[PDB]
Design an enzyme around this catalytic site. Structure first.
Site, short mmCIF file in Angstrom:
data_model
loop_
_atom_site.label_atom_id
_atom_site.label_comp_id
_atom_site.label_asym_id
_atom_site.label_seq_id
_atom_site.Cartn_x
_atom_site.Cartn_y
_atom_site.Cartn_z
N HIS C 555 0.63 -0.93 0.13
CA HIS C 555 -0.19 0.39 0.26
C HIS C 555 0.92 1.57 -0.23
O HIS C 555 0.86 2.02 0.87
CB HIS C 555 -0.46 0.12 1.43
CG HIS C 555 -1.73 -1.10 1.11
ND1 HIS C 555 -1.44 -2.86 0.89
CD2 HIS C 555 -3.38 -1.39 0.74
CE1 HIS C 555 -2.68 -3.21 1.38
NE2 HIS C 555 -4.10 -2.27 0.96
N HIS C 559 0.43 2.55 -5.17
CA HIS C 559 -0.75 1.59 -6.00
C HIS C 559 -1.79 3.03 -5.75
O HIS C 559 -2.31 2.55 -6.39
CB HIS C 559 -0.85 1.01 -4.24
CG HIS C 559 -2.47 0.77 -4.06
ND1 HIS C 559 -2.87 -0.32 -4.94
CD2 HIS C 559 -3.68 0.89 -2.85
CE1 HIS C 559 -4.52 -0.62 -4.18
NE2 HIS C 559 -4.94 0.06 -3.52
N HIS C 595 -7.69 7.37 -1.25
CA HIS C 595 -8.05 6.23 -1.03
C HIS C 595 -7.67 5.49 0.17
O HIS C 595 -8.17 4.82 1.25
CB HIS C 595 -8.74 5.02 -2.13
CG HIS C 595 -8.18 4.64 -2.14
ND1 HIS C 595 -6.87 4.18 -3.09
CD2 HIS C 595 -7.85 2.87 -1.97
CE1 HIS C 595 -6.26 3.31 -3.81
NE2 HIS C 595 -6.69 2.19 -2.66
N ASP C 596 -6.43 4.86 0.44
CA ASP C 596 -5.74 4.52 0.92
C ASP C 596 -4.47 4.90 1.99
O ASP C 596 -3.64 4.90 1.80
CB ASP C 596 -5.53 3.12 1.21
CG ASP C 596 -5.02 3.06 -0.17
OD1 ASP C 596 -4.21 4.18 -1.13
OD2 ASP C 596 -5.71 1.70 -0.63
C1 LIG Z 1 -7.15 -7.56 -0.18
C2 LIG Z 1 -6.77 -7.42 -1.52
C3 LIG Z 1 -5.11 -6.51 -1.15
C4 LIG Z 1 -7.65 -7.54 -2.87
N1 LIG Z 1 -6.36 -7.98 -3.41
C5 LIG Z 1 -5.89 -7.49 -4.86
O1 LIG Z 1 -5.96 -6.39 -4.66
N2 LIG Z 1 -5.10 -8.20 -5.02
C6 LIG Z 1 -4.31 -7.97 -6.26
C7 LIG Z 1 -5.13 -9.39 -5.14
O2 LIG Z 1 -3.83 -10.17 -5.32
C8 LIG Z 1 -5.08 -9.80 -3.49
N3 LIG Z 1 -5.09 -11.28 -3.16
C9 LIG Z 1 -5.86 -11.31 -2.28
N4 LIG Z 1 -6.73 -10.62 -2.36
C10 LIG Z 1 -5.81 -9.22 -3.24
MG LIG Z 2 -8.40 0.17 1.84
ZN LIG Z 3 -6.56 0.49 -2.18
#
Ligand SMILES: CC(C)Cn1c(=O)n(C)c(=O)c2nc[nH]c21
Ligand SMILES: [Mg+2]
Ligand SMILES: [Zn+2]
Ligand SMILES: Nc1nc2c(ncn2[C@@H]2O[C@@H]3COP(=O)(O)O[C@H]3[C@H]2O)c(=O)[nH]1
Ligand SMILES: Nc1nc2c(ncn2[C@@H]2O[C@@H]3COP(=O)(O)O[C@H]3[C@H]2O)c(=O)[nH]1
Ligand SMILES: CC(C)Cn1c(=O)n(C)c(=O)c2nc[nH]c21
Ligand SMILES: [Mg+2]
Ligand SMILES: [Zn+2]
EC number: 3.1.4.35
Lengths: 824, 69, 827, 69
Positions: C555, C559, C595-596
């Site tokens: 993050h 991102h 957003h984050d």
């Molecule tokens: C929980 C959140 C990071 C969602 N998310 C995501 O965006 N990507 C790209 C993943 O590969 C992923 N794998 C689990 N959750 C995921």
């Molecule tokens: Mg978030």
């Molecule tokens: Zn995000």
């Protein structure tokens, strides 16, 4: 004939007054009266007088013993019925509910020969009468005695009792018993057998004979009112005691207040329900209704516009065994909610009094045994609970008064006062929530501050390259390996000459200064004695370096210069003789963090601009902030160099840091300045240095004063530097002052002092000379006199003063030769 | 027995209709606290700190010039 | 004539009595009960017959009127008892209790056979106060019984002080107490029986029989007094409670408000309140001179807590004349209330002091002269302390000169004690007020440091806005045109970097280039010119956003920039802008970029389970609301405000759109509102041409908000639709972050992590990835592909990624299967 | 004059060792209160959980697997 004798007696008034007004012989009156009258009586008048006086004395004796009311009034009613030659009498007791008045019954159909069993009426058999229906209502409302010659001709007469009791009334006489200006009860005589209508003599006897029943009823009413007022006062006192115990939420406060006073209410059950206080819904909850996926709410609404939703109900069962129950989500068929009264109270906000709940139509009741114990609802009283903003926050409902009587005005007043007091107390809950939210926000802000200031994993590798030389993270390294790594990287003791009074940081970078700061701690020898972790020390130094702002003068370099000046004062100046190792440790640590978060403006600007610093701190605005921030950094486990220290040593170090950091204030130095002079004067006559060192090592207060003086001397150390280092730093402070003056001119719109404005930038040498003459000279002269090893400071100070004075004279000559020569 | 009033079960009354209920008690006990006389003097002040101790007036003026005041 | 009638009446005298009491009893009862001045020969002493007994009984009964003056009735009873008892003098000693020690003062004195009320009433200043253990009066008070003393000399507890004072000699005494049922109310006495050696038993019987009438009068008097006192106490308490809870305020204002309203219920001429100083410990610079020997140590009174006694504020309430209220900061020792020394004594001891006849008191120094021109002189005082919940005295309240001219009694003590008890409890509110102020100030201080540590300073802004080089002026001096020229010179080209495509990759680029690309993205929407956004504020805001993101594994600022670029591509390339306006698109992008903003690297479950302050504060959506709050905090800053040139309605709409967008990124909220977006998409297919659908959607706010939420959700997960090269690394970054959080969970807490988080199962990543693709992203991407034809590239990219992940998972499963049968099961 | 023959003030046949009453601290005085029945489950107890009520336990367990729940 007996009837002939009676008629001849009654239609002959002339003879009647003669024979009965005759002196009768004592034995004749003795035989005539039952048993035997004493010798005093001689005529019929005397006999009747004695008998009536004895009866009244017996009645008074009866009232004397205690509050009987009913028995005494029943006996006097029997006597009055005998006297008036009537055949019926009654007692109607005044009662007020819901703001309207009522006239119940307490004694009915009392006859000259009767017993208390057949005249008293239980609470379930009273014939209530409003203040408009019947003659009794007229008597109560007019507060006057009423005589009715014929009932059929009375406009305001009600026959309701006649069908029920199967009786015909031909005469009525009543009067209100008064306790001042409030009616207590009415006494009425019905169906005079003596004649067609009530004569005036009967009216006079009725008026006179009732002055004793009035007394008895007055005593009874006064006792009742006194008891009620005492109970109300106790309830209020206990509620006030419980409310102010602490700060909690609404539910805990309400439960405590309601439970503590459960003995002063005299009720069988009472339930408290709490209403939801959500004014508006979020977007993701209103979307389905607006898109037609769910139906809009359609139901009761409070006058504030909310939705009635009892989210918690607390029951208090008292008639049998105490059982306090809390319902998380009250079902719609709860024994209290199923009546529908609390919902109506929430919708309207009315105090509701119910006399016969089973025989009610507006609200439905169970009309049967609620529980196997056979407790049937018979009397209800519900009130709202509103705060100071006129918003209903709950509903309180009470059931089945213990004594078996309907709720009267006094009970309504008492419970209304209780709910009124509890409604105002909601302000505590709001403050509780606001305090909790403020604390959470402050903690979040502190964490976000701590993340940025602290030294991360990558940054520490500039000083502790364990990732390559050892191939391991610094946390998992051993103490010996960390020391071996630190030995190579750290500068030599003489590489940067940190022991001198002329050390200059202009040729060193920030990382070099951090390494020198660690090297000073290594030199003092406190690292090995106190088992200070080396990684923690490096991280603390880096975090302190990052804590300083990127401002002109009061940056990390100033803090390092002050710390180094303190170190060389302790070591080169031979002032360590009076202090231990722990004191030197605390002194250096406090010297590092004396300007940790300077914003670039002085205390007076903070006071004038109403900064939150000027509000939280009152006396020393900035100097107290730096100490708090520095101690906040040292509280973190990863940055605590005081990890391995005893409790006493920790408290001593904290106290020394508190003394040292605050001492940097110039006002405090100006105030407590002559004590140092007195200490120096005492030293000058004591003895050779050894004895003075032996003595001063034990005086705590004198050591603290010298500590503060050394803090002040180290703070202003930038002047005692060689003229090459000087005349360069003096520009930085001038730039900072000019920036503050610009801020003052633009924001506060005030003209700055001659020091703090860019226009008068050519008077800097004169101001520097004045500052040197005023502040620095005293402390540096006194320290030179105290210890002779600090003479270079005084010599360099005098040289700098000479240079600044020469510049000032040059400027003065220039301005003189311009203004008073060229123009003229 | 048949009781004096010949009434059993509950209280009777010759009054029919929707009952009336009391409104509330929201007037007899109801800027905050400014009409009270003598109210001006009360209140926490921000000048409860001594500016300076016994000092010469010239030194007091000199302190102001250097921002130490 | 009725001669035969009278013979018949003599024959049955019972019938004659019956007739007389029917036709004549009413007249005699009316006459006797009316004013008739009962005729009894009081000239001499003689036995009383039945007629005179009846007359005297009907007297003392004629007086049972409504007014019921107690003094007159009891005086009449005493005057009759004087003749009845054959005594010389009588008196009435009332009962009162002060300081817990009961007294017996006098009210009626020296009533003889022919006396009058004025000559026998006792003024409050002529009372002969008697202790309860000195005379026979005290003996009858203690024993609560009738006492007869035939000879005064033989009595051991007889006192002749009154005898010497009143030049009288007593040889006989008979007294009886008047009781309310368990407490004595008064004592009546007789002395010097006339024409007899001593009082006999018949006199005792007469006194007992005739004492009944006085008991009722005493009862009604006492009951009325008690009822009045209780009513006053209740009113005082309820008024004080009403005035305390008005608001939160310091102790001085609260106490003044509480004590001003109850002035009517306190029947006192004057009363003043002094406030003590609660400072416990001084500071080092205040204890230095005392220890060094520059000032003598403090010597004087001290409270039991261990503090110096110093009254810093005293409030005076004068009510006897013209109502005056004054406040005297730092009262002098010469103050009228303090000069007596009673407040200092109360502060030293913490005791309730009741004083009668204050001028004639030797312990204290009360003024014996009129304090004002009206002649008001102190006669009775009562002082009690105010104690908080830690048994520390806060102040002292004193009351003077009860209105009715009577010394303070038990009821007044109880009333004022309840008042002071309520006042002492209410000190919690000022303490909470001060704590609230300090906490708010501390919160404000720490929030500024975050602002400094996150804001972009003047030195960093020169890396983009190179105004110091192209010109000699700082950005503030430069106008808008020069800033525009510099920006257009510096900002990267749009189509060259492919900033509006669905395959944009940020791997080669640097973070500063990402910030410049964000500024270019803002420029490319034609939003800067429309709303007069200051360019310097835009650049500073973008740099502050870049700096605000933590250096976490996943993050990062990268991102956030990826999410913003995806939103821009959806608006422009995806042709989803046809519905929204320029302001709504600006809010879209701005909310996407923040957003984050302050992610810590842990999800909402960890925040809830570890009882973080964020979980306590927000509760429902912890991290999303935290990000929204922090992002709105930055925009509120003047130097970072890009919404400054917006009217109130436009600003409110933009803020509302931001709150809708930022919270919508929550995965549970998206999971709960999928069917509504599906219904909108299905409804979109019932229109003939796209123009009609666009016209209808431009006037439907709720469906636009739903599309807002769905596009935010699609942009958040956009990293899974990138080409295989980007996904191969992004998946590893995400897995590393999840493993870090899992190992944090294992250590700080004591629950094993889910297989999606534990580090040991690092080879099951393809299975989890394909499960995630099947579960979450496929629905939104397929729905958006159905809605608009231009979003198909995302669908084909994600399906290709799913194919590759499935192939990897199948290879891993085959390897595990082979390694467990040929090597573990069969061998 | 007066029946009690004194006009200056009240008179008592005693001396002047003044005695004063102690404050009452037994009736009312001697988190804070927990022995009250029903006090355990009455606090804030912030455990607001969305009922979901639209997902079967297959998809509920799948949702909980990924940590979104
Ligand atoms: C929980 C959140 C990071 C969602 N998310 C995501 O965006 N990507 C790209 C993943 O590969 C992923 N794998 C689990 N959750 C995921
Ligand atoms: Mg978030
Ligand atoms: Zn995000
Ligand atoms: N049976 C009976 N009825 C009474 C008695 N006293 C009063 N009432 C009746 O109760 C009624 C109440 O309303 P009213 O006063 O107009 O008229 C009254 C009388 O008719 C009583 O002693 N016995
Ligand atoms: N002159 C006079 N003295 C009284 C009277 N009543 C009581 N005393 C005296 O006052 C005293 C009060 O307590 P004592 O025991 O000394 O006994 C009493 C009597 O000596 C009274 O009516 N007239
Ligand atoms: C800036 C202020 C703390 C006092 N101060 C100072 O410390 N140094 C070193 C100066 O040169 C100086 N000149 C004016 N004020 C000064
Ligand atoms: Mg400083
Ligand atoms: Zn400094």
């Amino acid at each position: 004939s007996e009837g002939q004798v009676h008629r001849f007696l009654d239609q002959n008034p002339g003879f009647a007054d003669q024979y009965f007004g005759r002196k009768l012989s004592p034995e004749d009156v003795a035989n005539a009266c039952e048993d035997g009258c004493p010798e005093g009586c001689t005529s019929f008048r005397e006999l009747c007088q004695v008998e009536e006086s004895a009866a009244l004395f017996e009645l008074v004796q009866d009232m004397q013993e205690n509050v009987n009311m009913e028995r005494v009034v029943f006996k006097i009613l029997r006597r009055l019925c005998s006297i008036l030659h009537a055949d019926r009498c009654s007692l109607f007791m005044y009662r007020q509910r819901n703001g309207v008045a009522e006239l119940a019954t307490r004694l009915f159909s009392v006859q000259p020969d009767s017993v208390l069993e057949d005249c008293l009426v239980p609470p379930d058999s009273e014939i209530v009468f409003p203040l408009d229906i019947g003659v009794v209502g007229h008597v109560a409302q007019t507060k006057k005695m009423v005589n009715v010659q014929d009932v059929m001709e009375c406009p305001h007469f009600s026959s309701f009792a006649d069908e029920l009791t199967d009786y015909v009334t031909r005469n009525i006489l009543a009067t209100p018993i008064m306790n001042g200006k409030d009616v207590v009860a009415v006494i009425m005589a019905v169906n005079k057998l003596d004649g067609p209508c009530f004569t005036s003599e009967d009216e006079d006897v009725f008026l006179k004979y009732l002055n004793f029943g009035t007394l008895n009823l007055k005593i009874y009413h006064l006792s009742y009112l006194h008891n009620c007022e005492t109970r109300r006062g106790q309830v209020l006192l206990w509620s006030a005691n419980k409310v102010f115990e602490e700060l909690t939420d609404i539910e805990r406060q309400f439960h405590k207040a309601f439970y503590t006073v459960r003995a002063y209410l005299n009720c069988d059950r009472y339930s408290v329900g709490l209403l939801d206080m959500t004014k508006e819904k979020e977007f993701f909850d209103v979307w389905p209704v607006l898109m037609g996926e769910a139906q809009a709410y359609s139901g009761p609404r409070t006058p504030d516009g909310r939705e009635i939703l009892f989210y918690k109900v607390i029951d208090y069962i008292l008639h049998g065994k105490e059982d306090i129950k809390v319902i998380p989500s009250p079902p719609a068929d709860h024994w209290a909610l199923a009546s529908g009264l609390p919902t109506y109270v929430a919708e309207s906000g009315f105090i509701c009094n119910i006399m016969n709940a089973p025989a009610d139509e507006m609200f439905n009741f169970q009309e049967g045994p609620l529980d196997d114990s056979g407790w049937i609802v018979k009397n209800v009283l519900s009130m709202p609970i509103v705060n100071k903003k006129e918003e209903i926050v709950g509903v309180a409902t009470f059931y089945n008064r213990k004594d078996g009587k309907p709720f009267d005005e006094q009970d309504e007043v008492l419970m209304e006062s209780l709910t009124q007091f509890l409604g105002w107390s909601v302000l505590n809950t709001d403050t509780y929530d606001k305090m909790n939210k403020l604390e959470n926000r402050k903690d979040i802000a502190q964490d976000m501050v701590l993340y940025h200031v602290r030294c991360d994993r990558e940054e520490i590798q500039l000083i502790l390259p364990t990732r390559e030389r050892l191939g391991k993270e610094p946390a998992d390294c051993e103490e010996d390996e960390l020391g071996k790594i630190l030995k190579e990287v750290l500068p030599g003791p003489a590489k940067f000459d940190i022991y001198e009074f002329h050390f200059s940081d202009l040729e060193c970078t920030e990382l070099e200064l951090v390494k020198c700061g660690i090297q000073m701690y290594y030199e003092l020898g406190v690292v090995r004695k106190f088992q200070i972790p080396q990684e923690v020390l490096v991280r603390f130094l880096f975090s302190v370096s990052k804590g300083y702002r990127r401002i002109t003068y009061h940056n990390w370099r100033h803090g390092f210069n002050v710390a180094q000046t303190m170190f060389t004062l302790l070591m080169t100046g031979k002032l360590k003789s009076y202090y231990t190792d722990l004191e030197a440790f605390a002194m250096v640590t406090a010297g590092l963090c004396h300007d940790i978060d300077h914003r670039g403006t002085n205390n007076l600007y903070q006071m004038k601009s109403q900064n939150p610093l000027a509000k939280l701190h009152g006396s020393s605005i900035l100097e107290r902030h730096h100490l708090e921030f520095g101690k906040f950094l040292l509280s973190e486990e990863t940055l605590n160099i005081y990890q391995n220290l005893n409790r006493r040593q920790h408290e001593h170090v904290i106290h020394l840091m508190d003394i040292a950091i605050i001492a940097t204030d110039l006002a405090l130095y100006f105030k407590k300045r002559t004590m140092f002079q007195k200490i120096v004067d005492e030293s000058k006559n004591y003895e050779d240095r050894k004895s003075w060192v032996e003595y001063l090592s034990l005086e705590t207060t004198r050591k603290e004063i010298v500590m503060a003086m050394m803090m002040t001397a180290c703070d202003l150390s930038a002047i005692t530097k060689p003229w090459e280092v000087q005349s360069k730093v003096a520009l930085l402070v001038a730039a900072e002052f000019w920036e503050q003056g610009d801020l003052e001119r633009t924001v506060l719109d005030q003209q700055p002092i001659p020091m703090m404005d860019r226009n008068k930038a050519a008077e800097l040498p004169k101001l520097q000379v004045g500052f040197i003459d005023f502040v620095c000279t005293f402390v540096y002269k006194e320290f030179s006199r105290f210890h002779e090893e600090i003479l270079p400071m005084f010599d360099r100070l005098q040289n700098n003063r000479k240079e600044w004075k020469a510049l000032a004279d040059e400027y003065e000559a220039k301005v003189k030769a311009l203004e008073e020569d060229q123009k003229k | 027995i048949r009781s004096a009033t010949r009434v059993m079960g509950g209280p009777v009354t010759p009054r029919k209709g929707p009952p009336k209920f009391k409104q509330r008690q929201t007037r007899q006990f109801k800027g905050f606290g400014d009409d009270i006389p003598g109210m001006e003097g009360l209140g926490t002040d921000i000048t409860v700190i001594c500016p300076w101790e016994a000092f010469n007036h010239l030194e007091l003026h000199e302190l102001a010039q250097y921002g130490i005041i | 004539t009725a001669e035969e009638v009278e013979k018949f009446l003599d024959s049955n005298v019972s019938f004659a009595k019956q007739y007389y009491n029917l036709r004549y009893r009413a007249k005699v009862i009316s006459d006797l009960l009316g004013p008739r001045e009962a005729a009894v020969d009081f000239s001499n002493y003689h036995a009383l017959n039945s007629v005179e007994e009846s007359e005297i009984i009907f007297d003392l009964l004629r007086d049972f009127q409504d007014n019921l003056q107690a003094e007159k009735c009891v005086f009449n009873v005493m005057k009759k008892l004087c003749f009845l008892l054959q005594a010389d003098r009588m008196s009435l000693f009332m009962y009162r209790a002060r300081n817990g020690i009961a007294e017996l003062a006098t009210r009626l004195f020296n009533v003889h056979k022919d006396a009058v009320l004025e000559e026998c009433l006792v003024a409050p200043d002529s009372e002969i106060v008697f202790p309860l253990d000195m005379g026979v009066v005290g003996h009858v008070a203690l024993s609560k019984k009738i006492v007869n003393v035939p000879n005064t000399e033989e009595d051991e507890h007889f006192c002749d002080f009154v005898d010497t004072l009143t030049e009288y000699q007593t040889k006989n005494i008979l007294a009886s107490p008047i009781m309310n049922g368990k407490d004595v109310v008064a004592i009546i006495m007789v002395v010097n029986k006339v024409d007899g050696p001593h009082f006999t038993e018949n006199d005792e019987e007469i006194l007992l029989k005739y004492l009944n009438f006085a008991n009722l009068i005493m009862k009604v008097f006492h009951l009325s007094y008690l009822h009045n006192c209780e009513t006053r106490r209740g009113q005082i308490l309820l008024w004080s409670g009403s005035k305390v809870f008005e608001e939160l305020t310091d102790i001085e204002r609260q106490f003044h408000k509480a004590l001003y309203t109850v002035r009517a219920f306190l029947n006192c001429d004057r009363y003043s309140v002094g406030l003590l100083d609660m400072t416990k410990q001084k500071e080092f610079f205040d204890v230095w001179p005392v220890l060094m020997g520059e000032a003598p140590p403090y010597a004087g009174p001290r409270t039991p807590d261990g503090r110096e006694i110093n009254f810093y504020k005293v409030i005076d309430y004068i009510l006897h004349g013209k109502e005056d209220i004054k406040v005297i900061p730092n009262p002098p020792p010469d103050h009228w209330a303090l000069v007596s020394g009673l407040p200092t004594y109360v502060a030293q001891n913490g005791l309730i002091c009741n004083i009668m006849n204050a001028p004639s008191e030797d312990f204290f120094a009360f003024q014996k002269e009129p304090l004002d021109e009206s002649g008001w002189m102190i006669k009775n005082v009562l002082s009690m302390p105010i104690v908080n919940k830690k048994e520390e005295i806060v102040g002292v309240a004193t009351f003077y000169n009860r209105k009715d001219g009577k010394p303070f009694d038990e009821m007044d003590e109880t009333l004022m004690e309840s008042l002071t008890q309520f006042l002492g409890w209410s000190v919690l509110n000022p303490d909470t007020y001060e704590l609230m102020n300090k906490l708010e100030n501390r919160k404000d201080i720490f929030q500024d440091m975050v602002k400094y540590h996150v804001k972009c300073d003047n030195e960093e802004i020169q890396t983009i806005l190179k105004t110091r080089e192209v010109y000699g002026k700082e950005p503030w001096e430069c106008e808008e045109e020069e800033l525009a020229e510099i920006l257009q010179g510096e900002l990267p080209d749009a189509d060259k970097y492919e900033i509006n495509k669905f395959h944009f990759s940020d791997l080669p680029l640097t973070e500063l280039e990402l910030v410049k690309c964000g500024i270019q993205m803002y420029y490319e929407l034609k939003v800067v010119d429309k709303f007069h956004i200051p360019q310097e504020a835009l650049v500073r805001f973008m740099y502050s956003l870049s700096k605000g993101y933590r250096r976490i594994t996943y993050h990062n600022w990268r991102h956030g920039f990826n999410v913003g670029q995806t939103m821009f591509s959806l608006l422009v390339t995806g042709k989803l802008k046809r519905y929204f306006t320029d302001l709504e698109a600006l809010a879209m992008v701005t909310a996407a970029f923040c957003h984050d903003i302050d992610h810590r690297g842990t999800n909402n479950l960890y925040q809830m389970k570890s009882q973080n302050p964020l979980a306590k504060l927000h509760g429902s959506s912890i991290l999303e609301r935290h990000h929204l709050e922090f992002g709105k905090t930055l925009l509120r800053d003047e130097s970072l405000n890009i919404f400054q040139n917006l009217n109130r309605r436009q600003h409110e709409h933009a803020i509302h759109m931001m709150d809708i967008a930022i919270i919508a990124t929550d995965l549970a909220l998206y999971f709960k509102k999928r069917t509504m977006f599906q219904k909108i998409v299905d409804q979109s297919k019932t229109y003939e041409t796209q123009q009609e659908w666009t016209q209808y959607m431009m006037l439907d706010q709720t469906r636009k908000e739903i599309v807002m939420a769905m596009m935010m959700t699609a942009c958040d997960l956009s990293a899974i639709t990138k080409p295989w090269e980007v996904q191969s690394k992004v998946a590893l970054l995400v897995a590393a972050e999840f493993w870090e959080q899992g190992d944090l969970e294992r250590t700080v807490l004591q629950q094993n992590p889910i297989p999606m988080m534990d580090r040991n199962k690092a080879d099951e990543l393809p299975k989890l990835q394909v499960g995630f693709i099947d579960f979450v992203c496929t629905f939104v991407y397929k729905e958006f592909s159905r809605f608009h034809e231009e979003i198909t590239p995302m669908l084909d990219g994600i399906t290709n990624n799913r194919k590759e992940w499935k192939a990897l998972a199948d290879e891993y499963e085959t390897k595990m299967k082979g390694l467990e049968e040929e090597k573990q099961k069969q061998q």
